[PDB]
Amino acid sequence: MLQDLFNNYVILVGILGLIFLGVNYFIVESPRMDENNGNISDYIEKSGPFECGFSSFNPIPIAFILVALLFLPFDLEVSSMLPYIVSIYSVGIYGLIIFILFLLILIVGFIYEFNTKSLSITTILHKKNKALVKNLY
Amino acid sequence: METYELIDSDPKFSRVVRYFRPSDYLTWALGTIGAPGLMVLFEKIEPAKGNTFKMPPPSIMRIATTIGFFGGFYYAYTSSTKRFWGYSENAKEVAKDRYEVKKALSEKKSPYGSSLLNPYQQDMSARNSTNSQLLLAIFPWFNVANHQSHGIDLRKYYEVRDGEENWNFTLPPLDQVKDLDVAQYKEYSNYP
Amino acid sequence: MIPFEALIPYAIMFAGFCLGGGVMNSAITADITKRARGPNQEIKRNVGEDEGPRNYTKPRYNTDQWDKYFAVRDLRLTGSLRGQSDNAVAEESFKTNSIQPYSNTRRPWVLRRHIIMKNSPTKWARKYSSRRDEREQEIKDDYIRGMGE
Amino acid sequence: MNLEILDLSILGFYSLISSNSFESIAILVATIMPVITELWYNYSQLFALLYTLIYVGAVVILFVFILSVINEKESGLFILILVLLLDDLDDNESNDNDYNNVYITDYADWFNNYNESDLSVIGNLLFTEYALLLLIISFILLMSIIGLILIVKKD
Amino acid sequence: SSTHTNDSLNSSNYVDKLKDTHFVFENDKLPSEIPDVEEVGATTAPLLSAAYFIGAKCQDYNDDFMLCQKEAKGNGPIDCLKEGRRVTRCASGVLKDLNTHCSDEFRLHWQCLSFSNLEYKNCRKAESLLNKCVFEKMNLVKKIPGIPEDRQIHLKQNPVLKPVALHQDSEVAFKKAQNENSI
Amino acid sequence: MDLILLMLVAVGLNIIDIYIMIEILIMGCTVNTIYSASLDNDMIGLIYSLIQIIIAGVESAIGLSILVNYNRIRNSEEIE
Amino acid sequence: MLFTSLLLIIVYGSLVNKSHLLTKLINRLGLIIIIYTLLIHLNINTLENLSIGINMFNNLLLINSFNNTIIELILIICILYVLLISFNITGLSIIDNLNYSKRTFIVIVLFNIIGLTLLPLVNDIMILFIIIELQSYSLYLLTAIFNESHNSTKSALYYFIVGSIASFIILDATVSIYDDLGLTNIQYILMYIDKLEIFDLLCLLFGLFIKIGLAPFYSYSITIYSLSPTIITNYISLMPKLSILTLIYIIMHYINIVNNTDLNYVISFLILISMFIGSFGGLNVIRIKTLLAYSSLLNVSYMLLAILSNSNESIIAYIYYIIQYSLTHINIFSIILVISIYLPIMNNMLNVMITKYSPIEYINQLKNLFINNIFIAIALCISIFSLIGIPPLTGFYGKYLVLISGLNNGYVLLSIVLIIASSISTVYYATILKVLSFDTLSFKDIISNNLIINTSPENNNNEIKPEISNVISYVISSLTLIILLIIIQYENIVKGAYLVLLYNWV
Numbered sequence A: 001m002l003q004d005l006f007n008n009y010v011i012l013v014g015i016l017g018l019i020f021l022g023v024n025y026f027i028v029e030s031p032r033m034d035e036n037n038g039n040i041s042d043y044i045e046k047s048g049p050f051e052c053g054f055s056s057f058n059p060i061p062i063a064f065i066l067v068a069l070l071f072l073p074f075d076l077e078v079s080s081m082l083p084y085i086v087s088i089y090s091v092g093i094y095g096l097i098i099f100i101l102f103l104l105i106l107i108v109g110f111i112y113e114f115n116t117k118s119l120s121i122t123t124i125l126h127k128k129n130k131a132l133v134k135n136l137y
Numbered sequence B: 001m002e003t004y005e006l007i008d009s010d011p012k013f014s015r016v017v018r019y020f021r022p023s024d025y026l027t028w029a030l031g032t033i034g035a036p037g038l039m040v041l042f043e044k045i046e047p048a049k050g051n052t053f054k055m056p057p058p059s060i061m062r063i064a065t066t067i068g069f070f071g072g073f074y075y076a077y078t079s080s081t082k083r084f085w086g087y088s089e090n091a092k093e094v095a096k097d098r099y100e101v102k103k104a105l106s107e108k109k110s111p112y113g114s115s116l117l118n119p120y121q122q123d124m125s126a127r128n129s130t131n132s133q134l135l136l137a138i139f140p141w142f143n144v145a146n147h148q149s150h151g152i153d154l155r156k157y158y159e160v161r162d163g164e165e166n167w168n169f170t171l172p173p174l175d176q177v178k179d180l181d182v183a184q185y186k187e188y189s190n191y192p
Numbered sequence C: 001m002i003p004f005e006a007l008i009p010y011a012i013m014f015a016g017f018c019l020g021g022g023v024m025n026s027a028i029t030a031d032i033t034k035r036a037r038g039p040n041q042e043i044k045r046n047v048g049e050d051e052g053p054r055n056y057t058k059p060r061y062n063t064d065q066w067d068k069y070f071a072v073r074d075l076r077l078t079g080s081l082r083g084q085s086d087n088a089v090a091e092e093s094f095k096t097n098s099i100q101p102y103s104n105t106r107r108p109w110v111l112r113r114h115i116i117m118k119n120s121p122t123k124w125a126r127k128y129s130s131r132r133d134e135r136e137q138e139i140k141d142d143y144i145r146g147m148g149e
Numbered sequence D: 001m002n003l004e005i006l007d008l009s010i011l012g013f014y015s016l017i018s019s020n021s022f023e024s025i026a027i028l029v030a031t032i033m034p035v036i037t038e039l040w041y042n043y044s045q046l047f048a049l050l051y052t053l054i055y056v057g058a059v060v061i062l063f064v065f066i067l068s069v070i071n072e073k074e075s076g077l078f079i080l081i082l083v084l085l086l087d088d089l090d091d092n093e094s095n096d097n098d099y100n101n102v103y104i105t106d107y108a109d110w111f112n113n114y115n116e117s118d119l120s121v122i123g124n125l126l127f128t129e130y131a132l133l134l135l136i137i138s139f140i141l142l143m144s145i146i147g148l149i150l151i152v153k154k155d
Numbered sequence E: 001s002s003t004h005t006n007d008s009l010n011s012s013n014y015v016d017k018l019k020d021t022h023f024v025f026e027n028d029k030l031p032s033e034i035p036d037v038e039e040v041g042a043t044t045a046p047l048l049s050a051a052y053f054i055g056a057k058c059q060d061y062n063d064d065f066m067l068c069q070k071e072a073k074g075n076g077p078i079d080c081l082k083e084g085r086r087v088t089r090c091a092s093g094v095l096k097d098l099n100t101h102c103s104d105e106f107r108l109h110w111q112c113l114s115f116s117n118l119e120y121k122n123c124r125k126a127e128s129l130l131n132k133c134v135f136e137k138m139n140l141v142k143k144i145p146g147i148p149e150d151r152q153i154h155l156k157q158n159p160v161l162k163p164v165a166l167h168q169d170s171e172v173a174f175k176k177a178q179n180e181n182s183i
Numbered sequence F: 001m002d003l004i005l006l007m008l009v010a011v012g013l014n015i016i017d018i019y020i021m022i023e024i025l026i027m028g029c030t031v032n033t034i035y036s037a038s039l040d041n042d043m044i045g046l047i048y049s050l051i052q053i054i055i056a057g058v059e060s061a062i063g064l065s066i067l068v069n070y071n072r073i074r075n076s077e078e079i080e
Numbered sequence G: 001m002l003f004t005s006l007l008l009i010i011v012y013g014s015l016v017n018k019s020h021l022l023t024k025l026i027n028r029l030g031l032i033i034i035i036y037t038l039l040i041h042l043n044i045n046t047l048e049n050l051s052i053g054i055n056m057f058n059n060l061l062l063i064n065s066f067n068n069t070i071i072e073l074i075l076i077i078c079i080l081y082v083l084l085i086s087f088n089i090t091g092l093s094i095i096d097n098l099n100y101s102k103r104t105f106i107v108i109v110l111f112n113i114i115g116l117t118l119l120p121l122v123n124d125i126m127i128l129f130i131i132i133e134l135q136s137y138s139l140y141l142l143t144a145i146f147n148e149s150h151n152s153t154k155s156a157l158y159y160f161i162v163g164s165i166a167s168f169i170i171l172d173a174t175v176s177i178y179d180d181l182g183l184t185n186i187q188y189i190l191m192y193i194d195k196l197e198i199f200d201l202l203c204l205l206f207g208l209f210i211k212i213g214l215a216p217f218y219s220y221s222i223t224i225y226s227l228s229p230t231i232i233t234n235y236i237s238l239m240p241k242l243s244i245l246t247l248i249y250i251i252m253h254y255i256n257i258v259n260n261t262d263l264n265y266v267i268s269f270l271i272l273i274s275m276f277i278g279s280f281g282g283l284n285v286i287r288i289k290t291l292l293a294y295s296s297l298l299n300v301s302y303m304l305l306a307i308l309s310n311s312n313e314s315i316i317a318y319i320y321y322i323i324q325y326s327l328t329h330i331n332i333f334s335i336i337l338v339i340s341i342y343l344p345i346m347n348n349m350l351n352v353m354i355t356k357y358s359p360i361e362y363i364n365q366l367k368n369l370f371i372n373n374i375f376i377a378i379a380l381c382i383s384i385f386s387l388i389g390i391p392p393l394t395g396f397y398g399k400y401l402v403l404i405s406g407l408n409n410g411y412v413l414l415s416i417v418l419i420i421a422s423s424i425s426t427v428y429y430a431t432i433l434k435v436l437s438f439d440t441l442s443f444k445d446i447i448s449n450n451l452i453i454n455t456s457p458e459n460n461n462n463e464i465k466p467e468i469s470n471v472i473s474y475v476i477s478s479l480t481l482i483i484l485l486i487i488i489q490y491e492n493i494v495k496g497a498y499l500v501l502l503y504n505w506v
């Protein structure tokens, strides 16, 4: 299988990257031509954040962290299913039973993280209600 | 060194269960009721909280029975396996094994059973499950395949021992036994 | 009430796929066929008067290792990687043009130039310790030391 | 002009001067890409794509995920080029000169009429021959799922 | 399978640059002690078209050529040089026959293979004509070992997987035989 | 050159920079295995490389989890 | 039985409600699982049959009578450790409830026992790397099981980084071996044991030397052991050495086939250096766990001399030493988990901050234990006297047997240094005995009611109220008399070690 046609494509796309950047740099009118008030550098008002107009100045939930952390074990489970795809016929029943076992052990992990509700954001800080109880004497 | 006759170097899972002695079932029963008892015995030894005996909650006793249900079976499975390997008393199983094989060869069926697994898959399966009971205390692995690498010579099932000729079984030459390595590579030398 | 003004962009996107596909199907087929006509440029371009209808060769996909051996074998017979020929006897140049590629077996550049990847307990001993290389050099020396017998 | 050398010299230049964690994560991506590209050509196209799918797609974007969580706060040109030049001189990883100067070939043969990809053979052996290696791996993956939750989960 | 190797042509010229591949020729012919043979000159498509007729005609020599390789015990290339020429001569015999008996039936079929990605499933109409012609004029038949006669794939009247695009020369030649022969 | 331990100059001054150096170090081991396996036409070396890539991923996840909890442990006032 | 029950415990623990009683009851389910594992193991595995060595699972795992000895030992020591987390170590709810605050504690321990028991059996470089990670990953999780603790998490971060570098060195040695030979199975490598670079197996050892805390790598182990909770340090400072030292012994068995002297000199350089640091290091220390970390390094140095010598007497020296040292280690740490009830309470100067993770942290917190509990003080005295090497305790026979193996192989220099290093280390074992008893007669009649044990409620005032729980007391007493009275059955035990073979045969 030849890939010299593919190589020229990758090279052209690499050339297309330089063209997109520089075409802006050669077609925009000179700062003097428009208003001359300054370049992007000195014009710090124009080169700044957007805060809807008013100038101002990540303790993320642990549930978000466990979403990203648990992505890695579940990704290596999916990527290790790749060898079974292109060899499903020649491993027969034996490799099919092994594959199912390879999935059951990982599912017991899915059960564990489903019961603990690890991914739920939860609301421990707020949403409290109480019963007004009179304390007659 | 207590050595006996090697019935099967890799006994099949279904065979190992069918060869349980009554005492093996007792060990499986004892293991099943031992684990819930061991939880109770600990509480009698020492209460988990407080200073007085308190029966553990029924939920713990159900999970305890399951854990002791596998452990009892594993102990039963390994003890039954030693007989096949020859490490234990296997005179009773040897006659029982010989009756089945001599019957099997007689019907021209394979002693080992027909197999979905091709030649490489049969031999590969044997490698995984041979001597796998030594680590059966760590993780399970059973011979559930009808392979042919059992560490025996099928010639030894032709000679008649004491109390066997009365069976009057006729054994054909192995070359005519269905699903054996000595009866498959007749057309091509690499295809069965 | 079907809006045709709304479907104008789709008819242009339909032409976008057709433009790319129409070119690829025809240009690649024509190039493969032309190079499968003969071993020189004065044959590939011209069509003879006594030649019959032209049989185009479509591009090949889903190949394996035999198609890399078949391609070079076809190259040595016709001058093209997908040439056509069904002569029961090959040319006498077929027996003296086998291409056997010789290439080096050195480790990747990153494995031996990265500021971090090259540092390792055993990679230093390969690079700075003579213990391994002096032992192996003995076997090379004893090759020529045994030609006397 | 083996341009793969110039990519690493730039990479080796920025590894000596990186200050924050943005550049440190950049050295990771700037190292896999030469690893992937030098595997795509030459040695193994299958493991170039496995690296992209498993390293870049899975373990690299996790680094930048936690860098946004952790924090973002806070040499001389002569010594660097002197060090890089000194690092550049001796690049022979092995000292078997004949093994590095003499080329070799292999001879193909037609005995293998059942031609299938490497990933076909790897699956053929991993799911049959070394099914213990495959099963322990799912066991190591299982421990991580439990291991991540016990380390990080608060309550 | 498009794995890089050290034994044939690789995917791209960038592989060659990394490996520093030299494509080396050897002008030296074989020594006169080995009697010469006329190498087969057919390309990929004609061989795949006539493969089952080479199997039908050279079956004894192919088996004997391989049995020499099995029993040479690693010295196969050197100790089977004489048995390897019978196979080359036998296969040249078949291609020479197809050129002098079924030239148009043969060419039509392997033009179809060169038109349909060298796949047998796409060229059944041309292939059926070639098999019928070869049988009457050389007695060779196509047989796929290991299955009953009634269940061979190339005789399947209604295949599940069929070519997407038709070969014009195949469809035209087929219906002509539906008049010449199906009387 | 590396016998003076130059690679210590190339590792940044954060705990996350150490984690990356461990990955780049192990990456060299896998690339070495892929190199040998392809030359020998041996798929057993490719099985090893596949295991090394999968095992090197699990090592990253555990290390980051420890680092993440290490970070929030300081920022654990949460008395708002 | 271990693996199957682990899945049941994983699922069941994630179902039932988070509580201490249920967490403590699940810890008693694991104590059964480990017990069940030992009964099934001993049933099928026998010394008489495993003598030849048996390949399992496509030759990936090879088991013989030397490995089989340690698997049973590992299972035994894991029972004595689980007894701590499964029962009361003090009985005071404040101190003890730490052991029951984590539900995955027993699960991670069960993960490690699978990792520990399979490591000595490995027979393939592909499975060597996988198994060593299974053990290594389980230790990092156990070190960080108390995720609220700042010191515990800081230690697991230090542990993970050092182990990651250690595992990379191990992985790189195997890759280099595969580069030279192209073979993965260890038995196939033995066919080329004369044709490969024997120093690439030494690079493998340098990775395993980091994981056992051997100098110059000793720095991290001392820091880690002095920061983790005493219940955690009781496990991570002993178990890895049980399974790695067995593996190191086997790798050295194969190495001595070619009998390369340069390999032995480098290892002797590390053994010699470690004895120096293991002895002189502990002289100036205040923390008890830092003291037992230097003590651990010295004993590992002794056990490597038996490994390095690697003769027929080296099997006996190693097999005996690894058993007696484990029981001594369990006995000492079990006592330190108990005698925390006698600590005084303030009603000041030096502002010593104590936490519930290490209630006993300084050596002078052992003060006057001869007064508060004389019987347990002698048990700690007997245990320390074994570490010193005073006969006829278990500790003497370990050093005596190690010396036989060392001198029989010509390691004269190392034998003398170990006898110098033993005496230097006696200084800081004697300090523990000085603190235990020497100020008895001045404090004999003192008015003590501010001890931690005096905050225990009075139940009835008529029934007898024992101060220490039942199970922990029986373990301490049993292991103290076994240490003390080994002379009675020593001859049978040693003759029971002559039979443990590693391809000796005939």
Ligand SMILES: CCCCCCCCCCCCCCCCCC(=O)OC[C@H](COP(=O)(O)OCCN)OC(=O)CCCCCCCCCCCCCCCCC
Pocket: A017, D007, D008, D010, D011, D014, D018, D022, D023, D025, D026, D027, D029, D030, D031, D033, D034
């Ligand atoms: C298609 C091209 C994509 C790359 C475009 C950027 C190219 C610029 C050169 C950087 C890439 C070289 C590879 C080595 C990494 C070096 C990263 C670094 O040190 O910082 C570079 C960038 C600019 O900062 P600089 O002034 O150069 O350094 C001092 C700043 N305090 O500091 C920054 O972080 C600014 C944002 C740059 C983010 C780049 C992300 C890392 C690169 C990944 C994409 C390219 C992958 C590597 C390919 C080449 C490998 C040699």
Ligand SMILES: CCCCCCCCCCCC(=O)OC[C@H](COP(=O)(O)OCC[N+](C)(C)C)OC(=O)CCCCCCCCCCC
Pocket: B044, B045, B046, B051, G470, G474
């Ligand atoms: C075939 C022989 C089997 C013998 C029995 C073995 C199991 C022990 C349980 C007995 C019942 C029980 O626990 O009874 C309870 C007693 C007494 O407890 P206490 O301290 O007075 O607590 C206070 C009791 N109140 C509540 C009445 C006040 O506990 C014991 O004496 C425990 C003895 C230690 C265990 C011995 C095992 C030795 C292991 C040796 C192998 C290495």
